[PDB]
Design a protein around this nucleic acid. Structure first.
Length: 144
DNA sequence: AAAACTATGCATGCTCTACTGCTTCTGATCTAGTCGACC
């Protein structure tokens, strides 16, 4: 029961999403998405040459590209505030430190750096010096 | 009549077992806030 999702690094999907976001018009975004889809379909055809009945599809990447349409998964129960709290606890950052305060009151523009309304940007800035440069996770592992 | 052996009461030290006070862990309650989904 081989699945293409187990052979696709998550970094590739992240890079594709970043390229789509950092695009001017619809044409470039559609081109990038179509290139990714064609690569996935070619890999699917190559992998499943012999097997007859296959349940493998593009769902593993689709459920991440469009999280709002996910129905199989239940509510995560965590939003910006809970995620910031968990990041503070796990990273062992000081409670009263600058990073923790920035993460908690992310809407306050007191920082004057990055973005004062996008929590993901601040999380990325905080984690830049505390995280490696290359990942080792696949789409299937992230879904699990 | 004098000397040697033995008995018993009290002093001394040590060790072991209740009782009171201080410190720390656990449980129960309340109050404040967060997340889900809809309209």
């Amino acid at each position: 029961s081989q699945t293409v999702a187990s052979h696709v690094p998550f970094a590739d999907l992240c890079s594709t999403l970043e390229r789509i976001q950092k695009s001017k018009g619809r044409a470039e975004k559609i081109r990038h998405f179509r290139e990714f889809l064609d690569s996935w379909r070619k890999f699917h055809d190559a992998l499943h040459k012999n097997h007859k009945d296959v349940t493998d599809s593009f769902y593993p990447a689709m459920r991440l590209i469009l999280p709002q349409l996910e129905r199989e998964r239940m509510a995560y129960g965590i939003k910006e505030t809970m995620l910031a709290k968990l990041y503070i606890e796990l990273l062992n950052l000081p409670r009263d430190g600058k990073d923790a305060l920035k993460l908690l009151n992310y809407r306050t523009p007191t920082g004057t750096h990055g973005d004062a309304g996008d929590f993901a940007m601040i999380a990325y800035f905080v984690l830049k010096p505390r995280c490696l440069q290359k990942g080792s996770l696949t789409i299937q592992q992230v879904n699990d």
